[PDB]
Design an enzyme around this catalytic site. Sequence first.
Site, PDB file in Angstrom:
ATOM      1  N   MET A  29       0.817  -1.406  -0.010  1.00  0.00           N
ATOM      2  CA  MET A  29      -0.095  -0.067   0.094  1.00  0.00           C
ATOM      3  C   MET A  29       0.662   1.194   0.006  1.00  0.00           C
ATOM      4  O   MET A  29       0.347   2.324  -0.458  1.00  0.00           O
ATOM      5  CB  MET A  29      -0.953  -0.002   1.136  1.00  0.00           C
ATOM      6  CG  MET A  29      -2.181  -0.857   1.287  1.00  0.00           C
ATOM      7  SD  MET A  29      -3.228  -0.247   2.489  1.00  0.00           S
ATOM      8  CE  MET A  29      -2.518  -1.156   3.854  1.00  0.00           C
ATOM      9  N   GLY A  34       9.360   1.888   6.984  1.00  0.00           N
ATOM     10  CA  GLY A  34       9.047   0.239   6.734  1.00  0.00           C
ATOM     11  C   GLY A  34       7.824   0.475   5.875  1.00  0.00           C
ATOM     12  O   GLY A  34       7.382   1.375   5.233  1.00  0.00           O
ATOM     13  N   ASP A 139       4.193  15.766  13.995  1.00  0.00           N
ATOM     14  CA  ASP A 139       4.240  15.615  12.420  1.00  0.00           C
ATOM     15  C   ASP A 139       2.977  15.658  11.855  1.00  0.00           C
ATOM     16  O   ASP A 139       2.495  14.659  11.043  1.00  0.00           O
ATOM     17  CB  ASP A 139       5.003  14.221  12.125  1.00  0.00           C
ATOM     18  CG  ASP A 139       5.576  14.316  10.763  1.00  0.00           C
ATOM     19  OD1 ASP A 139       5.626  15.359  10.132  1.00  0.00           O
ATOM     20  OD2 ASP A 139       5.897  13.264  10.449  1.00  0.00           O
ATOM     21  N   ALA A 143      -0.574  13.954   4.744  1.00  0.00           N
ATOM     22  CA  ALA A 143      -0.365  12.440   4.820  1.00  0.00           C
ATOM     23  C   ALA A 143      -0.576  11.739   6.241  1.00  0.00           C
ATOM     24  O   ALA A 143      -0.907  10.383   5.939  1.00  0.00           O
ATOM     25  CB  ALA A 143       1.123  12.086   4.375  1.00  0.00           C
ATOM     26  N   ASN A 144      -0.573  12.294   7.144  1.00  0.00           N
ATOM     27  CA  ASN A 144      -0.808  11.761   8.566  1.00  0.00           C
ATOM     28  C   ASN A 144      -2.392  12.060   9.042  1.00  0.00           C
ATOM     29  O   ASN A 144      -2.786  11.701  10.212  1.00  0.00           O
ATOM     30  CB  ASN A 144      -0.217  12.205   9.607  1.00  0.00           C
ATOM     31  CG  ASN A 144       1.269  11.601   9.432  1.00  0.00           C
ATOM     32  OD1 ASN A 144       1.632  10.523   9.017  1.00  0.00           O
ATOM     33  ND2 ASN A 144       2.353  12.227  10.144  1.00  0.00           N
ATOM     34  N   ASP A 157       0.157   8.041  13.078  1.00  0.00           N
ATOM     35  CA  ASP A 157       1.656   8.232  13.334  1.00  0.00           C
ATOM     36  C   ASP A 157       1.939   8.853  14.431  1.00  0.00           C
ATOM     37  O   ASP A 157       2.122  10.269  14.800  1.00  0.00           O
ATOM     38  CB  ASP A 157       2.345   8.727  12.049  1.00  0.00           C
ATOM     39  CG  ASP A 157       3.774   8.172  11.836  1.00  0.00           C
ATOM     40  OD1 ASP A 157       4.639   8.289  12.894  1.00  0.00           O
ATOM     41  OD2 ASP A 157       3.996   7.831  10.773  1.00  0.00           O
TER      42      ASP A 157
HETATM   43  C1  LIG Z   1      -7.230   3.156   0.427  1.00  0.00           C
HETATM   44  N1  LIG Z   1      -6.754   2.986   1.874  1.00  0.00           N
HETATM   45  C2  LIG Z   1      -5.516   3.139   2.191  1.00  0.00           C
HETATM   46  O1  LIG Z   1      -4.577   3.344   1.255  1.00  0.00           O
HETATM   47  C3  LIG Z   1      -5.279   3.073   3.613  1.00  0.00           C
HETATM   48  C4  LIG Z   1      -5.725   1.931   4.487  1.00  0.00           C
HETATM   49  N2  LIG Z   1      -5.695   1.829   5.648  1.00  0.00           N
HETATM   50  C5  LIG Z   1      -4.459   2.578   6.294  1.00  0.00           C
HETATM   51  N3  LIG Z   1      -4.241   2.374   7.677  1.00  0.00           N
HETATM   52  C6  LIG Z   1      -3.473   2.904   8.389  1.00  0.00           C
HETATM   53  C7  LIG Z   1      -3.729   3.179   9.814  1.00  0.00           C
HETATM   54  C8  LIG Z   1      -2.781   3.773  10.766  1.00  0.00           C
HETATM   55  C9  LIG Z   1      -1.567   3.768  10.183  1.00  0.00           C
HETATM   56  N4  LIG Z   1      -0.568   4.065  11.013  1.00  0.00           N
HETATM   57  C10 LIG Z   1       0.915   4.069  10.379  1.00  0.00           C
HETATM   58  S1  LIG Z   1       0.767   3.372   9.048  1.00  0.00           S
HETATM   59  C11 LIG Z   1      -1.283   3.324   8.895  1.00  0.00           C
HETATM   60  C12 LIG Z   1      -2.140   2.671   7.929  1.00  0.00           C
HETATM   61  C13 LIG Z   1      -3.740   3.359   5.528  1.00  0.00           C
HETATM   62  C14 LIG Z   1      -4.184   3.693   4.429  1.00  0.00           C
HETATM   63  N5  LIG Z   1      -3.339   4.593   3.181  1.00  0.00           N
HETATM   64  C15 LIG Z   1      -1.810   5.184   3.660  1.00  0.00           C
HETATM   65  C16 LIG Z   1      -1.663   6.278   2.872  1.00  0.00           C
HETATM   66  O2  LIG Z   1      -1.964   6.310   1.554  1.00  0.00           O
HETATM   67  C17 LIG Z   1      -0.979   3.952   3.714  1.00  0.00           C
HETATM   68  C18 LIG Z   1       0.421   4.435   4.007  1.00  0.00           C
HETATM   69  C19 LIG Z   1       1.546   4.503   3.070  1.00  0.00           C
HETATM   70  C20 LIG Z   1       2.926   4.919   3.802  1.00  0.00           C
HETATM   71  C21 LIG Z   1       3.088   5.136   5.002  1.00  0.00           C
HETATM   72  C22 LIG Z   1       2.042   5.053   6.016  1.00  0.00           C
HETATM   73  C23 LIG Z   1       0.546   4.668   5.504  1.00  0.00           C
END
Ligand SMILES: CNC(=O)c1cnc(Nc2ccc3ncsc3c2)cc1N[C@H](CO)Cc1ccccc1
EC number: 2.7.11.1
Length: 281
Positions: A29, A34, A139, A143-144, A157
Site C-alpha cells: 500500500m 517500513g 508531525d 499524509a498523517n 503516526d
Molecule cells: C485506500 N486506503 C489506504 O490506502 C489505507 C488504508 N488503511 C490505512 N491504515 C493505516 C492506519 C494507521 C496507520 N499508522 C501508520 S501506517 C497506518 C495505516 C492506511 C491507508 N493508506 C495510507 C496512505 O496512503 C498508507 C500508508 C503509506 C505510507 C505510510 C503510511 C501509510
Amino acid sequence: RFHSFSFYELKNVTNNFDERPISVGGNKMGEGFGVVYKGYVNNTTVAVKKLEELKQQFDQEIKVMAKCQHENLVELLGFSSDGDDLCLVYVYMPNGSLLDRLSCLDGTPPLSWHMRCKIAQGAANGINFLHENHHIHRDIKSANILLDEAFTAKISDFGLARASTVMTSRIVGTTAYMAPEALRGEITPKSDIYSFGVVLLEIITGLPAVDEHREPQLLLDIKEEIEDEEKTIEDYIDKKMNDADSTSVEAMYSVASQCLHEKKNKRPDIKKVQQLLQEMT
Ligand SMILES: CNC(=O)c1cnc(Nc2ccc3ncsc3c2)cc1N[C@H](CO)Cc1ccccc1
C-alpha cells in the site's frame, strides 16, 4: 489492550508480505519507515506496517496508542514481537490519506467543500484530544490524516509524539509543515497548530505543502503573497469543487492565517481552532 499477533499470522494475512502494489493485485500500500501492507485477518481488512531508534518509535506508538482512544485518531489493533521484523497492525482506512484525496490519487473524485469542512473539524478534534491528554504530535500533515468509510478524519503516526518549552538535539518532522521554533529544536504543542495551519491551506487550495516545479515551492509562502495584497485567497481556492462559498472559505483561511503566526505565542490554542472551525459551519 492490543492483540499480540504472530509473525507467521501476519506473513499469512499479507500474502507473504507481497511487495507488488495493490493496483496490480499485490499487498503493498505504501513505502513511516517500513512498508505498509493490506492484510485480511479472518473477514477483517487491516493495515500491517512492517518496520535502533526504530524500536523506540515502535514502543512509543504502542505506548501513546494504549493511552489514546478517540473517534479522530487511528486505532492500533495489535503488534508483533516474535519473528524477523517488528510489525504494527491497524484498522484499514478505506479512503486513505487526506493528501491522496486532495491530490485525487488513483482517479478518486475531488472532496467537496462540505467534506473538507468536516475533515478540518475532525482533525482539529483529534489534535484537541492529544493536547488535552498532554501529547505533542510533532508531525501533523495531510499524509498523517487518514480517512475512514464516512471520510472521518483520523490522525495517524505517533512514533515521534512527546509528552507536554523544552529543546532537543535530533530535530524531527516534515520541513514544509514545520513551525520556525520546531525547526530550531523547540518542543511545544504550539508547533502542532502551525502544521495544522499548513493542512488548512492544503484543504482550501488542493495544493501540496511543497512542489519543486511550482512557484512558490512552499505553500506557506502563498500566505505572504495574499498578505502583501498581491493576491486574494479566492485566486488560490481549489477549482475541483462546486460548493465552496466565499464566506466559509475566508473563515477557514482566517483560522489558517492565525495558526500560521511565526510567533508561537500569537497562535491560537487547539480549543480556539475548534471553536473557530465550528463557527465557520
Ligand atoms: C485506500 N486506503 C489506504 O490506502 C489505507 C488504508 N488503511 C490505512 N491504515 C493505516 C492506519 C494507521 C496507520 N499508522 C501508520 S501506517 C497506518 C495505516 C492506511 C491507508 N493508506 C495510507 C496512505 O496512503 C498508507 C500508508 C503509506 C505510507 C505510510 C503510511 C501509510
